[PDB]
Amino acid sequence: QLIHKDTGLIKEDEVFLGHLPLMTEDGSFIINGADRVIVSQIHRSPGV
Amino acid sequence: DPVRQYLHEIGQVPLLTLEEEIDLARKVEEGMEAIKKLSEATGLDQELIREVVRAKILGTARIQKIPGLKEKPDPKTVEEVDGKLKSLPKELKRYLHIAREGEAARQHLIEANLRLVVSIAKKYTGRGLSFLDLIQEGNQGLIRAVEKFEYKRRFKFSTYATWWIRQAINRAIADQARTIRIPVHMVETINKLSRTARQLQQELGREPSYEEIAEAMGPGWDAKRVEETLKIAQEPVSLETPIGDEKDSFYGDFIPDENLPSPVEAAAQSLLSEELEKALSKLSEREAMVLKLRKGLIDGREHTLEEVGAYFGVTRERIRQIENKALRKLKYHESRTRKLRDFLE
Amino acid sequence: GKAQFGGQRFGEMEVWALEAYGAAHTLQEMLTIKSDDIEGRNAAYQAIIKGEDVPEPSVPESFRVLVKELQALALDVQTLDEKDNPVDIFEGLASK
Amino acid sequence: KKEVRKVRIALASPEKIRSWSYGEVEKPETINYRTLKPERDGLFDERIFGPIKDYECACGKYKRQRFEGKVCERCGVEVTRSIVRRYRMGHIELATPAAHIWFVKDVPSKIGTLLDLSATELEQVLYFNKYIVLDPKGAVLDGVPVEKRQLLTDEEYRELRYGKQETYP
Amino acid sequence: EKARDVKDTSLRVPPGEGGIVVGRLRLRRGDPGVELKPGVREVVRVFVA
Amino acid sequence: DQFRVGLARLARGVRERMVMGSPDTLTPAKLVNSRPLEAALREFFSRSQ
Amino acid sequence: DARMGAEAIQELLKELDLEKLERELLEEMKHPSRARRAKARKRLEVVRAFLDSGNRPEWMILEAVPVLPPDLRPMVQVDGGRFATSDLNDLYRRLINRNNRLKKLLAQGAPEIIIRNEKRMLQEAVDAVIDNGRRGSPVTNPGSERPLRSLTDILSGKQGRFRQNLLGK
Amino acid sequence: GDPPKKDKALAYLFGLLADPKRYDLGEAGRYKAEEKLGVGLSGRTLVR
DNA sequence: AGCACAATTTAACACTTTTGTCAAG
DNA sequence: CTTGACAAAAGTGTTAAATTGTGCTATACT
Ligand SMILES: [Zn+2]
């Protein structure tokens, strides 16, 4: 929803965003007609 | 950092109040009209005396010797017009001085509005051209905006300037950003295409097809045309583009050379020329000579009919019959040996 | 690679091997005729096809690329002779 | 003809560069967007670097081995092998002279060792931060006379050159 | 033999590889369900087991 | 993560598109572009190690 | 006369008499202090190198810029119709835009500020062509973080013209 | 790079630390740091 | 953004010369 | 080996279409 602070104009209006890849049941995606997988990454935990 | 350097350098020269602005514009126009009046004085062109005055202003010897190695000689055509303009009465003289001052004012005005240009170029990034390039194109557009400006219209110079800077930067994207040269018209065309595509992709919820986007483009637009313009729009690919996770391979070194004959090809051509040479030798001398006159086996060119007839002193028809006969005799001997039955691809 | 119908990469270590053996013409063929040398591989294939012994190559042709690349760096690369005289590996080509 | 037993490397003078040059590349294009032929003055231009085809000029007037080395009168393309495009070098004549970054940036900077300038100050000069004084002309700064090699920022340059003034609003 | 126009670009199975043809796929442009990149008419793909 | 990066770039696009045109009447449709997020996600899925 | 940049450096290098500096540094060398001695030594080493090489130091400041032949930095389309090109082409190109822009700006009568900026951009362009990335952030193709590969990068590196394509094949 | 303005300092150093959007310290990092230093934290921000 | 106009290239087209061939000597 | 007759192919000169290059716009805007 888009608004105007000073005007009080409310034009809500839906919109688009883009295309989001969906993960299959096995747990892999398909990019450009090729089955691909995103491996899990390991780093150190946030904090001090 | 060069950007820091230039930004600070223009940060040195301050802005200009309305008074300063109007006064500078005034002095500039006075300078120009002084140049015209001097054109009525000694009878020489405006830009002539103008560039001479500049040569006396924005540097001594450096304006002449390096806009390329050849322009207008320092001791000769510069200094003689200088001395010729030197030898005039008082009014034309004071107008000379006025002209010079006008030039200087032009320079300063240019500087403050260089700050302006920097703002505008700061707006335009993402190009396919670097920031400082944007700044400089905008700066040329600024010198341009300064030249044609009129203060009498009582408008703040900033607006007029802005338009010119903007158009100059767009001239940059048109003339620069793509590795291959794409002229202005199709640049604007492609821009409209992409813009509309974005619009109806927002509307439909999905990317269009060439047909619907062509219809959305109006008359004269079909699928083939948008496909073609899109075919032109695409950029080249860097030869050094990495292939795979390997650090040892590029994209470019996977490209074969079809321009250069392979050893097998050179050997093939060799064997062809030789075997043809031997298969030719069993013909009569004259007919063989005629054939190799036709083929380009002598000078490489193609000697027609009449030419061969002229060289051997006979009619062209005779030559024709001769070559046909030769062809058929080769048909026999080749039907035998089968050495030349290859090379048929 | 195989997919490109490629030839085997002869590494620097293998050069060191051949040098250790002391095989000069094997290393020569490896570095010239059998690898990148145009006229070398052409005349060689020609010779074997005609049943000769392959001739002696001249210019690896990657080395000429190296020369002109060095010249693009504004470094003058002079290939001299026994007596300190210019020998042009570009034959009537870049001479001008 | 003769053996090559020796290879030397040296600095190429501008004259040598121009001698190597078959012409200057003026225009920053590659090829036409459609015809895919080398642009007039462009980087891939045939008029200098040579023909794309063996013995065939751009326009296609002189077509054969018969003509050799003769420049065609329209395109200016020399009739010869198409391989010369690998060898023949062009150039770009620079408006204001520039430094080769090797002799600047090298660990023991060569030009810096010659003129006795530190990497820092020379970096400041070459990239146009601070001016340097060739001819002092009896100029003085802060009580000490300015001599050769001395670096001055924009302020001090403008001061000893155009004078010093103060504006009061 | 007339030197003719067009030349043969046909796809021939690489050396060391060979087998039987199972799958057949043809995507031609100007046909539903498929959007092909600009400049390209049709893509033809063959499964070989 | 990459989604929010692309979302940030989209935010900047929105911010650039406000200060021009007609600040009075603008639908969020004209204010928002697909490409920042589209190319962000595309880059993450295709490229990332 | 206080000039900033490669012009001034070129002028100084041309003014240099290597024989003067030879004798003078030889004399400066026998000074009892060790530091001054060694420094004078390295200096005199560069100087002597220039002396018996025959090379002039001002050559280090480039006027004409050599341009590599097209087939060495090729541009050719592949299967699918899409093109391909070397980074050196783009580098050379940008160098050309900056050089020509400056070329017309000098004849324009543009103020010293713009001239200085474009000239600086010209130095950084030439350097970006020679060796990219050593000074400042490496110039990259727009939208891509991959640094453009210059001549220096062609010669050196594990993949350089020596190791990859020469000492092995 | 830019001249030492006061409002620039304010905005910049707000975006560096106090900004919940621009600076997000992990919820796990929030929790862990909260249970390590022997203190507690309102948000995920270094400062408020 | 987008248009308008000059300078320019391409493809357009109408009529000419020769180049290839046919038939009969 | 020769000649004349013909059309198909390759030329040659003026024009139309589209193609490309260059310039311009004024609330203010640094
Ligand atoms: Zn020609």
Side-chain angles (χ1 to χ4, degrees), chain A, chain B residues 1-121 123-345, chain C, chain D, chain E, chain F, chain G, chain H:
Chain A
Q1 68 163 22
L2 169 137
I3 333 283
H4 285 94
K5 182 77 168 184
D6 54 331
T7 308
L9 197 289
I10 25 183
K11 192 55 187 175
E12 188 181 47
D13 205 62
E14 211 192 35
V15 264
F16 186 58
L17 260 194
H19 295 72
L20 174 61
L22 311 89
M23 177 179 290
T24 56
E25 204 147 316
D26 57 88
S28 63
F29 299 87
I30 298 95
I31 278 75
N32 297 18
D35 316 283
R36 287 181 129 258
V37 65
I38 307 178
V39 298
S40 307
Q41 190 176 26
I42 167 67
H43 68 44
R44 85 252 210 280
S45 172
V48 317
Chain B
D1 186 274
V3 207
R4 172 207 61 164
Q5 181 92 7
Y6 176 77
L7 222 168
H8 175 261
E9 284 189 33
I10 70 158
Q12 220 72 11
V13 168
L15 285 175
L16 72 175
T17 72
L18 190 54
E19 302 191 15
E20 308 183 49
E21 188 176 359
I22 302 301
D23 180 83
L24 291 187
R26 205 242 317 132
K27 202 158 55 185
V28 167
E29 296 196 353
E30 288 191 2
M32 298 189 60
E33 300 187 40
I35 303 178
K36 184 189 183 68
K37 201 149 153 65
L38 282 173
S39 181
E40 300 178 32
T42 51
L44 289 83
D45 298 29
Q46 345 282 5
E47 196 135 8
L48 196 43
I49 309 164
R50 178 189 201 89
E51 204 175 4
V52 168
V53 168
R54 289 219 190 109
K56 194 65 168 58
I57 294 298
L58 80 320
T60 50
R62 63 179 304 180
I63 328 300
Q64 334 284 54
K65 209 91 66 178
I66 40 181
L69 39 147
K70 276 182 167 60
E71 232 299 298
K72 57 203 310 304
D74 256 316
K76 179 170 130 51
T77 55
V78 179
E79 226 291 317
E80 78 179 327
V81 178
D82 235 28
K84 184 171 59 181
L85 288 171
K86 150 82 89 59
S87 62
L88 271 50
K90 132 106 74 172
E91 299 218 343
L92 320 164
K93 196 79 56 59
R94 84 185 187 98
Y95 262 41
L96 156 126
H97 296 77
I98 289 175
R100 304 194 169 195
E101 206 163 18
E103 279 287 333
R106 168 173 172 258
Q107 311 294 291
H108 297 163
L109 202 154
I110 291 166
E111 291 154 346
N113 300 305
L114 289 178
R115 287 151 78 83
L116 167 65
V117 172
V118 168
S119 70
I120 297 189
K123 256 300 192 61
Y124 264 110
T125 75
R127 291 305 87 158
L129 197 49
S130 64
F131 190 70
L132 268 60
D133 290 328
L134 269 55
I135 308 178
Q136 293 286 37
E137 276 317 308
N139 289 332
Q140 174 149 224
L142 171 66
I143 276 187
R144 247 296 318 155
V146 170
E147 292 180 0
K148 205 184 176 180
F149 174 72
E150 300 173 303
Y151 66 92
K152 299 176 177 299
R153 305 182 73 150
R154 302 281 287 270
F155 287 109
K156 186 68 170 299
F157 168 78
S158 62
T159 311
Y160 192 60
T162 48
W163 282 110
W164 279 109
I165 314 309
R166 179 191 325 257
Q167 83 83 27
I169 300 181
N170 277 28
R171 188 60 52 87
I173 354 157
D175 234 88
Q176 206 57 237
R178 314 185 191 276
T179 301
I180 318 177
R181 155 68 79 88
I182 290 84
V184 155
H185 54 353
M186 297 192 328
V187 174
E188 306 294 341
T189 310
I190 290 163
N191 298 345
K192 182 180 184 302
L193 287 163
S194 180
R195 166 184 165 98
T196 314
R198 143 166 59 258
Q199 233 201 35
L200 43 62
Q201 194 212 49
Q202 155 72 97
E203 306 173 33
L204 199 66
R206 76 171 185 265
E207 304 180 354
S209 62
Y210 302 100
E211 183 183 14
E212 59 184 276
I213 184 62
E215 166 74 325
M217 285 290 293
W221 283 99
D222 50 83
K224 158 157 286 187
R225 184 184 171 190
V226 55
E227 183 180 35
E228 222 78 9
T229 52
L230 221 170
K231 125 194 292 183
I232 311 169
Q234 63 191 31
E235 46 271 353
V237 185
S238 184
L239 281 178
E240 340 290 355
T241 302
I243 290 194
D245 28 81
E246 310 115 15
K247 22 200 63 63
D248 52 28
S249 68
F250 309 153
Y251 172 66
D253 45 344
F254 281 169
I255 288 186
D257 192 335
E258 8 273 14
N259 310 81
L260 205 50
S262 180
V264 289
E265 308 174 19
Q269 170 212 336
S270 304
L271 290 173
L272 179 63
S273 183
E274 299 162 28
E275 223 74 46
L276 278 174
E277 180 67 25
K278 241 120 192 306
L280 161 112
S281 59
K282 59 212 57 177
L283 294 185
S284 173
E285 185 174 354
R286 170 166 77 153
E287 52 167 296
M289 198 90 179
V290 164
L291 252 61
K292 63 179 175 49
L293 256 201
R294 301 315 207 92
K295 299 327 207 159
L297 297 171
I298 301 292
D299 48 336
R301 274 165 45 174
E302 218 143 61
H303 294 204
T304 129
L305 234 44
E306 272 276 59
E307 294 191 56
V308 194
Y311 116 94
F312 247 166
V314 301
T315 65
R316 36 150 164 77
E317 184 76 28
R318 178 66 226 185
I319 303 294
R320 161 186 157 319
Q321 301 169 355
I322 282 177
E323 37 229 356
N324 298 129
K325 217 126 193 307
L327 268 291
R328 303 189 313 278
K329 308 181 97 170
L330 266 83
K331 276 257 196 56
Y332 176 71
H333 256 242
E334 173 51 38
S335 69
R336 298 190 72 191
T337 58
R338 198 197 285 268
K339 287 206 167 62
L340 279 164
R341 206 175 310 234
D342 272 319
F343 312 92
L344 79 102
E345 302 160 13
Chain C
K2 167 172 177 179
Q4 291 76 229
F5 197 76
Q8 298 298 316
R9 164 155 186 84
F10 190 89
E12 299 175 336
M13 302 173 176
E14 289 73 2
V15 151
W16 305 339
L18 268 59
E19 291 171 329
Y21 275 95
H25 286 71
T26 302
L27 183 62
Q28 256 289 126
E29 286 186 337
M30 272 292 147
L31 287 167
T32 54
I33 290 182
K34 320 204 318 178
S35 61
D36 67 333
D37 178 20
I38 17 88
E39 174 239 349
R41 68 187 178 218
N42 288 28
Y45 184 82
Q46 163 101 349
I48 307 178
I49 262 56
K50 285 181 169 56
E52 264 84 353
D53 187 37
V54 302
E56 164 67 22
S58 301
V59 261
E61 162 67 9
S62 46
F63 173 79
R64 290 219 302 271
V65 175
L66 188 271
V67 169
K68 241 51 184 177
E69 277 162 336
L70 268 172
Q71 286 196 346
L73 278 168
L75 303 176
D76 185 30
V77 177
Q78 320 175 41
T79 58
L80 285 311
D81 67 339
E82 97 237 3
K83 53 185 61 179
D84 303 319
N85 291 121
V87 173
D88 193 11
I89 61 184
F90 314 92
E91 43 217 354
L93 304 169
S95 344
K96 164 194 173 72
Chain D
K1 226 303 178 184
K2 216 63 185 63
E3 249 79 358
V4 41
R5 220 158 275 196
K6 301 179 74 173
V7 172
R8 196 210 236 184
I9 178 178
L11 309 183
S13 60
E15 307 88 306
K16 216 65 178 181
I17 296 170
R18 305 157 95 129
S19 293
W20 300 345
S21 210
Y22 277 77
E24 184 207 2
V25 173
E26 245 175 344
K27 251 163 171 291
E29 295 92 333
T30 56
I31 48 183
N32 183 255
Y33 71 90
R34 174 82 83 262
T35 70
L36 304 179
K37 84 162 194 59
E39 284 295 90
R40 173 67 180 186
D41 291 332
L43 277 70
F44 296 86
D45 180 35
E46 309 177 73
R47 311 177 69 260
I48 48 182
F49 303 107
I52 250 178
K53 280 290 183 298
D54 309 25
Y55 306 98
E56 305 232 312
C57 77
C59 58
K61 69 157 317 307
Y62 293 109
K63 287 308 216 178
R64 206 42 72 98
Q65 249 274 56
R66 186 179 192 262
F67 322 99
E68 190 166 3
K70 175 155 187 170
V71 281
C72 83
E73 282 64 27
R74 13 189 52 84
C75 16
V77 172
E78 214 144 334
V79 48
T80 181
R81 295 176 64 186
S82 67
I83 211 65
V84 298
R85 295 190 78 223
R86 314 189 85 264
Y87 322 113
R88 304 186 172 188
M89 308 187 61
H91 78 298
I92 308 166
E93 192 63 34
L94 217 59
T96 177
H100 192 270
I101 204 191
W102 274 10
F103 313 106
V104 182
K105 252 337 208 190
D106 181 34
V107 192
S109 176
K110 298 285 132 53
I111 57 171
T113 314
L114 247 185
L115 296 175
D116 204 330
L117 273 309
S118 177
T120 313
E121 42 194 5
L122 193 35
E123 160 78 41
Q124 291 172 328
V125 190
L126 291 163
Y127 288 84
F128 322 103
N129 193 324
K130 310 160 65 178
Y131 306 84
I132 55 98
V133 181
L134 309 94
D135 196 314
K137 261 295 196 66
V140 67
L141 168 132
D142 298 329
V144 290
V146 52
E147 305 176 76
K148 50 185 180 178
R149 297 168 172 82
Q150 185 167 350
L151 305 95
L152 332 168
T153 196
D154 38 30
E155 284 184 334
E156 22 212 351
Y157 180 67
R158 299 181 320 176
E159 196 216 7
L160 280 77
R161 165 71 172 140
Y162 297 139
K164 192 67 164 193
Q165 6 78 319
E166 195 77 49
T167 319
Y168 306 104
Chain E
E1 192 177 46
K2 154 83 158 58
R4 207 182 77 189
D5 269 271
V6 96
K7 270 291 297 297
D8 177 37
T9 30
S10 66
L11 186 67
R12 308 185 188 186
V13 41
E17 300 179 350
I20 59 139
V21 180
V22 176
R24 178 191 81 125
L25 198 76
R26 179 171 193 175
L27 306 179
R28 116 188 289 173
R29 91 164 331 278
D31 286 62
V34 45
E35 273 293 302
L36 226 168
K37 125 147 68 70
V40 212
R41 298 180 101 255
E42 48 186 346
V43 292
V44 179
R45 307 202 276 228
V46 176
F47 284 87
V48 175
Chain F
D1 199 335
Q2 289 295 333
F3 189 92
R4 91 177 46 183
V5 175
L7 220 55
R9 203 167 307 269
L10 174 58
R12 285 210 309 175
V14 162
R15 231 158 189 167
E16 293 180 52
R17 243 122 266 208
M18 296 152 35
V19 290
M20 39 202 298
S22 60
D24 315 339
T25 304
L26 285 178
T27 62
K30 289 182 183 184
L31 195 66
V32 176
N33 208 335
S34 301
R35 23 120 63 111
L37 189 69
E38 179 92 38
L41 269 51
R42 178 194 180 275
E43 219 79 302
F44 171 75
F45 278 80
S46 297
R47 273 136 193 87
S48 180
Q49 312 302 99
Chain G
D1 186 36
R3 310 187 214 191
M4 50 163 47
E7 180 197 21
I9 308 301
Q10 173 195 15
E11 185 165 330
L12 296 175
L13 290 170
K14 166 162 287 186
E15 265 194 350
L16 254 183
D17 182 87
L18 302 175
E19 315 181 31
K20 248 76 137 303
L21 208 62
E22 181 195 33
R23 306 182 242 97
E24 172 177 19
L25 283 174
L26 278 170
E27 244 282 344
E28 256 270 2
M29 147 135 306
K30 38 185 176 182
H31 189 77
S33 181
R34 299 182 281 272
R36 177 177 293 177
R37 173 146 33 96
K39 219 172 184 179
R41 177 184 320 171
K42 300 198 148 98
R43 197 165 194 228
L44 180 59
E45 188 167 337
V46 174
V47 172
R48 283 285 186 84
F50 270 108
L51 272 178
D52 23 271
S53 60
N55 302 4
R56 282 290 182 87
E58 50 269 40
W59 297 354
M60 303 156 107
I61 312 300
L62 232 71
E63 294 189 15
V65 174
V67 169
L68 197 68
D71 286 34
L72 302 186
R73 23 136 212 145
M75 191 183 198
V76 64
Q77 36 182 346
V78 299
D79 200 328
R82 289 163 104 80
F83 254 85
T85 184
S86 308
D87 291 344
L88 188 85
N89 290 315
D90 285 325
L91 284 176
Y92 266 163
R93 188 170 52 88
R94 253 161 50 90
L95 167 60
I96 296 180
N97 329 328
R98 291 194 166 113
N99 179 63
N100 282 76
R101 202 186 311 154
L102 180 76
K103 216 180 304 181
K104 224 55 183 180
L105 277 181
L106 281 174
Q108 179 113 40
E112 245 271 317
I113 281 77
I114 304 179
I115 300 302
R116 278 175 53 179
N117 188 62
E118 191 83 50
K119 172 194 50 176
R120 173 167 43 248
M121 296 164 56
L122 182 65
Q123 179 68 54
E124 86 177 57
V126 170
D127 297 338
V129 168
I130 301 295
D131 164 73
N132 182 30
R134 220 204 173 133
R135 237 199 54 86
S137 63
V139 45
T140 67
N141 256 333
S144 189
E145 288 300 314
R146 184 196 52 83
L148 258 53
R149 198 153 90 86
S150 59
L151 301 167
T152 290
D153 303 320
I154 288 182
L155 297 199
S156 61
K158 327 291 206 64
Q159 314 197 55
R161 198 56 58 195
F162 293 113
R163 297 186 65 172
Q164 192 72 19
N165 305 115
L166 250 41
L167 294 177
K169 282 159 180 170
Chain H
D2 34 327
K5 262 290 176 46
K6 321 192 77 173
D7 79 320
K8 291 219 200 71
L10 179 69
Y12 178 88
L13 285 165
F14 168 77
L16 255 290
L17 274 63
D19 201 322
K21 322 291 202 57
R22 287 182 134 271
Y23 184 93
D24 182 43
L25 186 137
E27 174 65 41
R30 172 202 193 275
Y31 172 70
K32 196 191 69 62
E34 177 159 344
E35 65 180 0
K36 72 165 270 57
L37 305 177
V39 287
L41 212 68
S42 305
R44 316 202 205 176
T45 59
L46 291 177
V47 300
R48 298 174 339 198

